Write a structure and sequence with these properties.
This is part of a larger assembly, with four copies of chain A. In chain A, 25% of the residues lie in helices and 15% in strands. The first copy, chain A, has 727 residues and is α/β, with parallel strands linked by helices. In chain A, strand 8 and strand 9 form a beta hairpin. The two termini of chain A are 50 Å apart. Chain D: Homotetramer.
């Protein structure tokens, strides 16, 4: 060997580069100077490779790693080949059970800092000073599919954050919608079995579009609120960077005085909210099933660090019963019009892992991992989650020492009398393994609860009632939140919701199930019920037309913070544009394009009908990132076609389809000079249309107009015209 | 609170102290300055305790570790109690499967050094320089019993040594007898199932005295040689310090020129060879089932470091076929009169572990863990062993990363393309996980074999023959090695062997099995078979009386290295003497006794009818180690009774029995002044008797005579007189 | 070949015999006519052996079970020997973790029957009718020692009964003294760590006679009551047949009208109460460490069925 | 052994032979079969050596490997014929 090319092009540069410019790499090679306390303490288990000899695991150097030991060179393999056996054995035991739910996910390292001290409301140490930085490890995920399933499915997304604080690990384990599907953890296996692949044949993967899900939903109207979010474009985010996160349950903040405040946790995406459209999402599960995982990783390698603002909705203990819903009911959201989100800090994700399995796959988060200054509530869904994550981690990660797996280790001290268990790493020197003891002078010792650095003491909440298996009558209301959700959506968001339900219910084979779901929609909103019914060829009865809509939520008839798009929050930095090249590109158009993209932090992908390079009109050699078919429009946010020799691609089927697909999917399109010939493939008026940028050259205002469209994400006014396009 | 006594007597002194003087403790607290390269590298996972707060595994401080969280102080325990749940969950999962064989064992840290370079015969780096120190971890064990079974059972002993070399771990996994019971690995489960507790009722523990063992033995005469070692006093060693160790198999040494030399490995105990007698051993399993584990640990805390000399039996490739037996047959020993053991180096065990479970229980040794400079042979029992150990470790230690458990880790570099698996600690940064690769320039890389630091390449032995399941005809001889062993024993050794078989066969319920074993003994030696038959009320037939004895082994009719005692090798340092106190001890006797014992490194334990203290004749306050019943004569090597007020213990039942038990078990006894009144208890002549030290006071020659008896270990001439003794 | 002696003296007679008269044997060979519903349902998974060929686990008959496959009779073992590999692999994976506590234990099958209907105080179906028999499986044990430790140590004894009822399994998991050492489950690991072998050297086995235990007891006076039982001759029973058993906790009986009655469960030994003396017990741990296991099995083989009220 | 939790994966219903299987292997995680054989080893006299070995033969015989001739040195080497 000397396999590497002599020019060094096998190794990516250790500096921020745009998506697709270099091969991606382990975080610690790609960005060796990005550090935080967690990332520095993982340094003891990191292994290098360059300049080392290949060995067995026992440190024996290997001479020939190409062959098994045999009796004669065409003979039988011998049992004494301990090198083969160790290598095959390790390979044979590589896999561990995937997570029962949220098996599919993507993770990154980062840090958090508060905006100011929150000691008036919580004694939680990570929130006590704006200069105190807490390292974090975040894992984003889907819910239903296996570890090998696709990213852009329609589903809820998980959003889990491990805070490595100085007084313990705090895991904030949330999703991307503000409520869950069910109220009591006793029904979690029933709900999850219903949405997962059906048990006789294990179909379908990553989809709720099947009979058992809609059967369960039709029989359990508590589910309807999260089902509404899942059927909206919230179920198909553009990126884990452009979705919100929520803890869902009401928890408690506890201050040094012992006062409890009810809280609901929020993550606000600083890149803004943005989702795909169903056809694009579903096709993308086939063109690039790793699309979210890839775009997260590459955004970090490019310096487009995912940033989220931590927000709290705070409710005084005395206001527990002032809403028309139960605050402990996880199928109910707290409208931001009633209880605003107070901004409290920012988290930045600025480094990828080194080994996906070691750090992402083995990561273990628990909602029960809280610290002094925080506490639980009686939310019956949250209460059952406190049992389940520790239990599931004993078999997923092989034993009770999963806190010793490097990614999961606290960065603060931990000492106790727990001993042994499978794969015990820590070697205890304590003469005692029990307390109280005199032989080690009772160390390690308990610590009284206090303002800081004190022991954990539960908030002394009053408990009164009988031992009962019973749902609180306050939780038996199921249509007002789904209604408030529906009425807060724009007209196109409502349409997407109708089309989500219609598509999904079309795949339910038993027709009575679709009719039972349509009946439930009629108790939410009649316009929604009717439009779904019409796509299913179902007719509402007399009685269904007279169902009285549920009441407003505390007087609210809408809450624009529930919409993805009603209030503009577009950010173009980190988005990507496809540029369709020709064999003689007008280089003046390219410079103007590339310069304007660069100024907003927008990336470009130069596409052509083959790989290699093409030469512009001034001799600039342009390297091609991908072909038209290899990097479809689904993977980009907008498409620009510069002038040059358009005859080269004017009859290219793939080139024409690229624009028809982008057009169908409502993406901004910009055509310079003779690129305007492509207006006939997308049947666009001679005079132009909103959403289509066109001019003689890709000049001054042409780029500003494209970038304005991109900031608004998609061209929703084109919806009525895409119906006709065969694409 | 306040638990430690204010005088600090809860903590043992950090310096060498005699057995029983202080509470024993973790190695790193007891002897913090004893270091070696492996002990230093374990420092990264060692945990402290003093001055730390008590936490959960996630680093959250605990305020109340005495109570569960409940609804009211007499209410039901709440599911939200995460502190209770982690603590009980870790406890609930403490246990891991015990080793299938050798589950019971005791271990210690130490170091090895060769006497001179062995470069001429092996390129093994640990043996290339007398100044090169190799850290070791050694585990001694029994074979049959579980991890909770007793130490002083009659069984074979394991003696496994892990060498942390600069070119890889080398495990030398041997036993305390030079042969094994069976020839081919395929019968290992059969042999082990036969010796282990019987399957219907799981009895008996720690014993071969039962029908299935002797049934297998009587049908598989290959077992007879190791059975003779086990029935001898070799099966009941006095200590892991006073037994020999052997690799058993013939292995190969490979030098830099590629020459192979056959080698059999040996460990010589520098404390000498010494065993118990059956009655003592059996009773000791009940009075102190942890006797060997305790004795080892305390010898190391006292500075009596177990020391062993590594020795090689070397045989040139050309002499492979020159013996009467096959060198690859593991039921055959290589007589030291034909092939002397050449001294190679010294191993010293000088520090105990910190945590038995983490370092002892999880330690994993494999005979397949060899390094360049060593190689295997076709011994068919060893060949099968190469498969078994890695296999068993995937379940016992939970996955294929058992090399990352701290005690098992190489101290030299290890790098390769193995990834994942349960409990993966190492975080790999190599962009490649395969070779050949270009993206990491093919690192880590293969290394050609060579004189030092080269890759492992198997010795190119010629193989020729058909694929067969067939025992070599050269292995078909079963009685000459058993006969050589027998004839090399002293007369009292022979009697102990007769009694071992007689005792064991008396526990076999089916009489025909005892008859068939007796018939096999008659093919070894008629004197042995007749004496066993007579103890079993069996009469040999006329053809059994005419079976021709097997031939001598290469002309030898005996080899004194096979006896424990024929060639004196006694060493008193680290032995212990019981001193039976009275309530007015003559202090002049005690000073003479204790100073003489101290000069030879012999320990003492001051015994009485109660605990606390007694006052000598001159006011000296004497602290009592144990009562007569609490520390029986079984635990000591000799007994001394000083003068004083003998009428205080003259009629104590326990005091008298102490002497009868030590007298029956052939230990030296010394009686000073009026203590000679006890001569009537042990019916000893007025004139005295060899083995009994007696005088007017414990003064000049008294102690030298007692120490001479101790140097010879036991008073074998007393055997004919102990048969009368009711004790 | 091989055989069994021609006189058939290798096989125990299938009828009640006294301790030591014959080799002991699996129950369904020793007492083929003893049945109950549980014992009969286990017949689907019972395996015989006589008259069957030796095979791999995949049903392939084995021709030579004495040798590995090698290249020449003195050659190296070949990787293709799948018979050897399955055989050693099964053997290598025999062991499972022992119980964290109560690892040392001896068990037997049997049956339970109430004297009269308890329908006035409980709706439990196994106690509703004096002619309704409930199969049981009982496991008796020590607490501290491993599964290979000794039987006649000084310790508490566990007495666990599995009732196979018509409305579900009821497990009555008790001990041989009416109280436990500690009050709250949160201290269990603390107490058990203190009585168990000390963590630096893993000594001593099957004994509370050591510093950590007595340190814990001296700092936690709530332990004293069970300590008193443990130090009496209740800590060294003569047999599992001659000790009491107790559920320890207060549980509840619920009748068909919904009334709750507090209840504490007891087992009375119909063989009477009897214990060893310390010296005898401690010596017996060395002369016969399987004494309670052996004497229970042999009592059942002899027709001296352990009976408890 | 790790995918299916132990050495008794032949007892999982789908994997079970439909023909007889008897041998001296015992124990292992999740052991379903309850063995009544007084012996768990061979050779044994206590169960008259059952279950027993069967010689190879034309039908219903024990497995015996074909006696191919092996000749060469112990090498880690690719056959030149494969290149
Ligand atoms: C508000 C409702 C819930 C939310 C927001 C939620 C969120 C999550 C997230 C984000 C993950 C993946 C964490 C990771 O990335 O590793 C997860 C995993 C999991 N969840 Fe929850 N969950 C909810 C309800 C429940 C309930 C009610 C249960 C059972 C009672 C449950 C059991 C589990 C389990 C067993 C896992 C796998 C954990 C592992 O293997 O480490 N979840 N959940
Ligand atoms: C000369 C013959 C043998 C010797 C000297 C020997 C020695 C030993 C020793 C000393 C140990 C315990 C290591 C420790 O303290 O952890 C051990 C364990 C073991 N032996 Fe061997 N043994 C022999 C034959 C065999 C054979 C033929 C097999 C199976 C083919 C076998 C399978 C095992 C297994 C499975 C373990 C447990 C290992 C673990 O769990 O790490 N042994 N043996
Ligand atoms: C009155 C108090 C208790 C009694 C009478 C009792 C009794 C027993 C008995 C008889 C067994 C062995 C069952 C068998 O033969 O398989 C056992 C096992 C066990 N006990 Fe308890 N115990 C008590 C308290 C506790 C507590 C407080 C805990 C933990 C909170 C606990 C945890 C365990 C565990 C983990 C096992 C092993 C079970 C298994 O592996 O199947 N015990 N106990």
């Amino acid at each position: 060997d000397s396999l590497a090319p002599e020019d060094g092009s096998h190794r990516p540069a250790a500096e921020p580069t745009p998506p697709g410019a270099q091969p991606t790499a382990p975080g610690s090679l790609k960005a060796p100077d990005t550090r935080n306390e967690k990332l520095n303490s993982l340094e003891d288990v990191r292994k290098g490779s360059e300049n080392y000899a290949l060995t067995t695991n026992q440190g024996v150097r290997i001479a020939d790693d190409q062959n098994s030991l045999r009796a004669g060179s065409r003979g039988p393999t011998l049992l004494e080949d301990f090198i083969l056996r160790e290598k095959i054995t390790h390979f044979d035991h590589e896999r561990i059970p995937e997570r029962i739910v949220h098996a599919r996910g993507s993770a990154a390292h980062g840090y958090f800092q508060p905006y100011k001290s929150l000691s008036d409301i919580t004694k939680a140490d990570f929130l006590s000073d704006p200069n105190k930085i807490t390292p974090v490890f975040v894992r984003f995920s889907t819910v239903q599919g296996g570890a090998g399933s696709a990213d852009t499915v329609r589903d809820i997304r998980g959003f889990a954050t491990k805070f490595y604080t100085e007084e313990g690990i705090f895991d904030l384990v949330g999703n991307n919608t503000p409520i869950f599907f069910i109220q009591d953890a006793h029904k979690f296996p029933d709900f999850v079995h219903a949405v997962k692949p059906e048990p006789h044949w294990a179909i379908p993967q990553g989809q709720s579009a099947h009979d058992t899900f809609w059967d369960y939903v039709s029989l359990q109207p508590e589910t309807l609120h999260n089902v509404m979010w899942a059927m909206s474009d919230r179920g198909i985010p553009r990126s884990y960077r452009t979705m919100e996160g929520f803890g869902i349950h009401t928890f408690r903040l506890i201050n040094a005085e012992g006062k409890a405040t009810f809280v609901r946790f929020h993550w606000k995406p600083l890149a803004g909210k943005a989702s795909l459209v169903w056809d694009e999402a579903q096709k993308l599960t086939g063109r690039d099933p790793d699309f979210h995982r890839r775009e997260l990783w590459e955004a970090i390698e490019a310096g487009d660090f995912p940033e989220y603002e931590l927000g709290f909705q705070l409710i005084p203990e005395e206001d527990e019963f002032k809403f028309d819903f139960d605050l402990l009911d996880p199928t109910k959201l707290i409208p931001e019009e009633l209880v605003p989100v107070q901004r409290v800090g920012k988290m930045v994700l600025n480094r990828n892992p080194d080994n996906f399995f070691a750090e992402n796959e083995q990561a273990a988060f628990q909602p029960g991992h809280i610290v002094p200054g925080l506490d639980f509530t009686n939310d019956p869904l949250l209460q059952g989650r406190l049992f389940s994550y520790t239990d599931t981690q004993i078999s997923r990660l092989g034993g009770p020492n999963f806190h010793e797996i490097p990614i999961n280790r606290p960065t603060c001290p931990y000492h106790n009398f727990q001993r042994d268990g499978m794969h015990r790493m820590g070697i205890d020197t304590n003469p005692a393994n029990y307390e109280p003891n005199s032989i080690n002078d009772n160390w390690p010792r308990e610590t009284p609860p206090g303002p800081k650095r004190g022991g954990f003491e539960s908030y002394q909440e009053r408990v009164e009632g009988n031992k009962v298996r019973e749902r609180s009558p306050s939780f038996g209301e199921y249509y007002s939140h789904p209604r408030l959700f529906w009425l807060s959506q724009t007209p196109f968001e409502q349409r997407h919701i109708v089309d989500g339900f219609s598509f999904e219910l079309s795949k339910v084979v038993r027709p009575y199930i679709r009719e039972r779901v349509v009946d439930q929609l009629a108790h939410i909103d009649l316009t929604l019920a009717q439009a779904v019914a019409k796509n299913l060829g179902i007719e509402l009865t007399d009685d269904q037309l007279n169902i009285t809509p549920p009441p407003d939520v505390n007087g609210l008839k809408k809450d624009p913070s529930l919409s993805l798009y009603a209030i503009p929050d577009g950010d173009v930095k980190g988005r990507v544009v496809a540029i369709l090249l020709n064999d003689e590109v007008r280089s003046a158009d390219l410079l103007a394009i590339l310069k304007a993209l660069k100024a907003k932090g927008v990336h470009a992908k130069l596409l052509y009908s083959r790989m290699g390079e093409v030469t512009a009109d001034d001799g600039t050699v342009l390297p091609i990132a991908a072909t038209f078919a290899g990097a479809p429009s689904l993977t980009v946010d907008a498409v620009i076609v510069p002038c040059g020799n358009i005859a080269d691609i004017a009859d290219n089927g793939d080139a024409n389809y690229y624009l028809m697909e982008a057009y169908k999917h409502l993406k901004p399109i910009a055509l310079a000079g003779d690129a305007r010939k492509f207006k006939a493939t997308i049947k666009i008026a001679d005079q132009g249309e909103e959403g289509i940028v066109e001019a003689d050259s890709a000049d001054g205002s042409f780029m500003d107009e494209l970038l304005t469209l991109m900031a608004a994400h998609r061209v929703w006014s084109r919806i009525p015209k895409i119906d006709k396009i065969p694409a």
